[PDB]
Amino acid sequence: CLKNVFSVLLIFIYLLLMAVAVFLVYRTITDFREKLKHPVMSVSYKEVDRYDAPGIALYPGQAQLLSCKHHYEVIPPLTSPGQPGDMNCTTQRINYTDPFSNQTVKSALIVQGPREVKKRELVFLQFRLNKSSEDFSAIDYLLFSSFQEFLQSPNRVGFMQACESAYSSWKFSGGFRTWVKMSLVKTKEEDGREAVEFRQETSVVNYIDQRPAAKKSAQLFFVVFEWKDPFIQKVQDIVTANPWNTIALLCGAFLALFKAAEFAKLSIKWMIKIRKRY
Amino acid sequence: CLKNVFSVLLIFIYLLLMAVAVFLVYRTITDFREKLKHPVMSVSYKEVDRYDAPGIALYPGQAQLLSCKHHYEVIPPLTSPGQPGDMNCTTQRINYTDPFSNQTVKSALIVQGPREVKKRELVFLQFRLNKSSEDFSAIDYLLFSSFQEFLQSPNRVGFMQACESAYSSWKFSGGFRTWVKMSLVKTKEEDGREAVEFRQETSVVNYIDQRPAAKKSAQLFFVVFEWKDPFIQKVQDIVTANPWNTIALLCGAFLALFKAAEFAKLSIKWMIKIRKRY
Amino acid sequence: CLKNVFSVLLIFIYLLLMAVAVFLVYRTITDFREKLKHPVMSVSYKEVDRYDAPGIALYPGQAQLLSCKHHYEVIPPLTSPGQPGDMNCTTQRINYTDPFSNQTVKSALIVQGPREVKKRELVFLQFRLNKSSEDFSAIDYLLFSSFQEFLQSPNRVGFMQACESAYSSWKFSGGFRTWVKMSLVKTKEEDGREAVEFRQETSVVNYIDQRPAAKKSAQLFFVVFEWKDPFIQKVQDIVTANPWNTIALLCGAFLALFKAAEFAKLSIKWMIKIRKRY
Numbered sequence: 001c002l003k004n005v006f007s008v009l010l011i012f013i014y015l016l017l018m019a020v021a022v023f024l025v026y027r028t029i030t031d032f033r034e035k036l037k038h039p040v041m042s043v044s045y046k047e048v049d050r051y052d053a054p055g056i057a058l059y060p061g062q063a064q065l066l067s068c069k070h071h072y073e074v075i076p077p078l079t080s081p082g083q084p085g086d087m088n089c090t091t092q093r094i095n096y097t098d099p100f101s102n103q104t105v106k107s108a109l110i111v112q113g114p115r116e117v118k119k120r121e122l123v124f125l126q127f128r129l130n131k132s133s134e135d136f137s138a139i140d141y142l143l144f145s146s147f148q149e150f151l152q153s154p155n156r157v158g159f160m161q162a163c164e165s166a167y168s169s170w171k172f173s174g175g176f177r178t179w180v181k182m183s184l185v186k187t188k189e190e191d192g193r194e195a196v197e198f199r200q201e202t203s204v205v206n207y208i209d210q211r212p213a214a215k216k217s218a219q220l221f222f223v224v225f226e227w228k229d230p231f232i233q234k235v236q237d238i239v240t241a242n243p244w245n246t247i248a249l250l251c252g253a254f255l256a257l258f259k260a261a262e263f264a265k266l267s268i269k270w271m272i273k274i275r276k277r278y
Numbered sequence: 279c280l281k282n283v284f285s286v287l288l289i290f291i292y293l294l295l296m297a298v299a300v301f302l303v304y305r306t307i308t309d310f311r312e313k314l315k316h317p318v319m320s321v322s323y324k325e326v327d328r329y330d331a332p333g334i335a336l337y338p339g340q341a342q343l344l345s346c347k348h349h350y351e352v353i354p355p356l357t358s359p360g361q362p363g364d365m366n367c368t369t370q371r372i373n374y375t376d377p378f379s380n381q382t383v384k385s386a387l388i389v390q391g392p393r394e395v396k397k398r399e400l401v402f403l404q405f406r407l408n409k410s411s412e413d414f415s416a417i418d419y420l421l422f423s424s425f426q427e428f429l430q431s432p433n434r435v436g437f438m439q440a441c442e443s444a445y446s447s448w449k450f451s452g453g454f455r456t457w458v459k460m461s462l463v464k465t466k467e468e469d470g471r472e473a474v475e476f477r478q479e480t481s482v483v484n485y486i487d488q489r490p491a492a493k494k495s496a497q498l499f500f501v502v503f504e505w506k507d508p509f510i511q512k513v514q515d516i517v518t519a520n521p522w523n524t525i526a527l528l529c530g531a532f533l534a535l536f537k538a539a540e541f542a543k544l545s546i547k548w549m550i551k552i553r554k555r556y
Numbered sequence: 557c558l559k560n561v562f563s564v565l566l567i568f569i570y571l572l573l574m575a576v577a578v579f580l581v582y583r584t585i586t587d588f589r590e591k592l593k594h595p596v597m598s599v600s601y602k603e604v605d606r607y608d609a610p611g612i613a614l615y616p617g618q619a620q621l622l623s624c625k626h627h628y629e630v631i632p633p634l635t636s637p638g639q640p641g642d643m644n645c646t647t648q649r650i651n652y653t654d655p656f657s658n659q660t661v662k663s664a665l666i667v668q669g670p671r672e673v674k675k676r677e678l679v680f681l682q683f684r685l686n687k688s689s690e691d692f693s694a695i696d697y698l699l700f701s702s703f704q705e706f707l708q709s710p711n712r713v714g715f716m717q718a719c720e721s722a723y724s725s726w727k728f729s730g731g732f733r734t735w736v737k738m739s740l741v742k743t744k745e746e747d748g749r750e751a752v753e754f755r756q757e758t759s760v761v762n763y764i765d766q767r768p769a770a771k772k773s774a775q776l777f778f779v780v781f782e783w784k785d786p787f788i789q790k791v792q793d794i795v796t797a798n799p800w801n802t803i804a805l806l807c808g809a810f811l812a813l814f815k816a817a818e819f820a821k822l823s824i825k826w827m828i829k830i831r832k833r834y
């Protein structure tokens with residue numbers, strides 16, 4: 001009767017503790033799986049006094065590089081457009097076959113980019129393309145981390161074929177002065193290596209072709225490559241769920257439930273004492 | 279005297295354990311509230327072999343669509359600007375009333391965008407606007423996820439009025455070839471639905487109008503829509519704080535404090551034994 | 557013999573529990589250090605009915621501000637380019653010395669930017685630069701949070717010298733209508749103050765200079781400053797590791813290990829009872 005009712009109610013509350021433990025374990029499994037599916041990303045900005053000289057692989061095609069200069073000032077000085085000028089950059093011409101065509105072979109002009117961002121160093125390039133019939137004259141450029149790595153790397157063709165994939169390729173148009181402010185984003189993945197990518201913001205400024213004012217009629221390309229700021233953006237995903245913390249938390253919960261059960265036994269004893277007193 | 283001093287000191291240390299428990303509970307409350315206020319964002323890039331044909335709602339106004347083409351090559355071929363050309367895209371003209379004017383009715387030309395990013399497929403559009411007096415000629419365009427969803431959706435006016443809000447609208451100018459490299463960002467919120475948005479990077483290339491070299495004097499708009507890469511950016515916030523883990527951790531802490539109290543009792547017994555030995 | 561083997565095996569399992577505790581503590585140390593090194597970033601978009609009037613510090617140089625207007629419509633109305641027009645904005649001219657030159661003194665024209673994003677308010681500025689010989693005509697502009705803060709701040713020179721550092725400076729070119737859609741990103745760091753930065757997306761539209769069609773031959777700069785959307789992006793790093801949670805979890809683990817040890821003692825007693833029964 002009453003004794004049996006109390007006994008079955010208390011075995012029921014013990015089963016309730018066991019069910020709470022099982023529900024906690026199931027919720028832990030689900031939360032661990034969800035956390036594994038969705039690692040959380042962290043971004044840290046690491047300042048560098050001077051950047052490693054980037055490699056700017058340009059694809060002029062028929063465009064003739066009139067001049068290349070390294071300018072430490074915030075702006076390039078006045079120029080003499082349309083004619084060859086002094087060249088003061090490090091260039092390397094390489095003809096590789098892009099893996100995505102495998103048939104067409106492209107010639108690239110790798111230029112050593114600016115190093116000292118703190119001095120606002122920039123590289124100013126001027127190309128000239130003779131009369132053409134394309135109606136849209138632009139030159140492709142691809143940025144990769146280090147020009148020296150390219151120089152001292154065997155099978156430079158292999159290095160370039162890796163860049164045509166691991167790096168994006170943009171365009172700069174004629175009749176502008178495409179000012180490219182570039183930044184480094186290094187993403188760290190779980191499987192070791194850290195991948196470096198080039199972000200770049202482009203600002204086009206019209207070129208005033210009133211100076212020739214003659215039958216020149218030849219496209220002029222002006223470009224400036226410069227580092228946006230001394231900060232490299234390190235981005236890495238973090239696996240918020242690790243087995244050891246989960247095991248420790250579940251063990252603590254199980255210990256708490258066990259002490260709850262022994263407290264229930266002590267409550268049994270207390271009720272027995274109260275009944276005895278009556 | 280000494281007995282009373284020890285007794286009050288030990289009830290004090292028990293109260294110290296209780297105060298440590300209360301401080302831990304208060305810190306847990308504050309941390310849980312702060313974590314609820316600030317869920318942490320996670321980004322995952324999901325690769326798709328081919329994108330769902332996006333809908334490009336253009337607003338030419340008086341501009342006449344000279345031609346539309348789907349080009350699988352990395353570049354469009356040579357054109358014949360200023361004159362009507364072959365049209366090889368899927369277009370649908372719809373006149374809806376934008377909810378933000380509610381009075382002005384705008385006509386849109388929905389074009390089926392490129393699907394196969396892996397083939398570097400792009401859609402090249404050419405419009406011609408006769409002589410005008412605006413001094414700034416540009417055409418609005420709005421990107422939405424699926425053109426087929428628009429086709430097979432009742433009250434297409436309602437669908438477009440939803441896009442004039444759930445999607446951004448940019449411009450492309452005349453005298454350029456606006457190359458738009460577009461990407462999909464899908465943000466998952468707590469309350470169910472996942473919202474898709476279009477990021478886009480635009481590269482303007484001057485159009486060489488030397489080919490006409492006559493009294494044509496009519497604005498020409500050239501646009502290229504292309505997928506930047508096969509990766510859709512899934513972004514979702516994660517509520518790092520859940521009640522069950524907090525309860526388990528607090529229960530473990532309380533169990534530890536209880537065992538500390540019973541260890542203090544055992545220390546009482548040990549001191550009593552030491553005194554007895556003397 | 558067997559008794560000694562069992563005794564040494566069980567002191568070995570006790571040492572195994574101690575070693576598991578030590579390994580858990582070491583893993584906790586490593587995880588806490590890694591989490592401290594890499595706080596996780598959270599982004600929240602806070603909607604604002606109207607923005608605080610931003611300050612647009614322009615650097616015309618010799619360019620003459622033909623006109624400034626506040627337009628609530630989505631587009632500016634028709635203009636009369638090349639000639640002075642009505643001015644209806646709040647401007648303040650200040651000549652400060654940029655800390656990075658310390659020798660060159662720059663004159664800035666601070667304009668009160670648009671406030672009511674919800675009305676799609678924008679500020680349209682027109683400058684005229686007489687015949688020059690630069691070949692690349694552009695005007696620098698720098699955005700800072702509040703124009704009123706600049707007005708009611710002593711040593712306005714100090715305020716501007718702070719902006720030439722805490723804010724980025726972009727350019728807008730002549731012959732375009734640079735449409736600048738700007739947004740606010742507020743980053744909260746551990747050491748108190750919250751830093752406000754201006755993101756901006758720029759859309760250049762060719763200016764049709766056919767209206768003059770004469771010997772005017774003077775550069776015209778057109779700019780539109782407008783808020784991209786009513787959402788300010790709050791970004792803050794979160795230190796996922798706090799000492800109290802780590803202590804609670806480790807204490808729970810230690811309690812679990814202690815109960816495992818006492819369960820091992822109970823297993824000793826159970827084996828002794830079984831042997832006695834035989």
Ligand SMILES: CC(C)CCC[C@@H](C)[C@H]1CC[C@H]2[C@@H]3CC=C4C[C@@H](O)CC[C@]4(C)[C@H]3CC[C@]12C
Binds near residue numbers: 247
């Ligand atoms: C093996 C590689 C691919 C990683 C994925 C393995 C994951 C899914 C496994 C490894 C450790 C597991 C945890 C370890 C043990 C337990 C036992 C008990 O506490 C229930 C939950 C809990 C906490 C498990 C959740 C799932 C888990 C996280």
Ligand SMILES: CC(C)CCC[C@@H](C)[C@H]1CC[C@H]2[C@@H]3CC=C4C[C@@H](O)CC[C@]4(C)[C@H]3CC[C@]12C
Binds near residue numbers: 306307310525
């Ligand atoms: C109800 C919706 C809006 C979500 C917000 C409810 C939040 C604030 C409540 C629900 C569960 C609560 C927790 C649950 C119970 C306890 C009891 C004891 O452990 C103290 C802290 C702790 C851990 C609380 C912190 C605040 C809490 C997180």
Ligand SMILES: CC(C)CCC[C@@H](C)[C@H]1CC[C@H]2[C@@H]3CC=C4C[C@@H](O)CC[C@]4(C)[C@H]3CC[C@]12C
Binds near residue numbers: 588592799802803
């Ligand atoms: C002091 C400022 C610079 C912050 C850095 C101090 C960090 C490294 C210290 C402070 C609290 C420490 C924790 C506190 C105490 C313990 C004791 C035991 O549980 C081992 C791990 C654990 C959990 C430590 C991990 C390292 C720790 C996180």
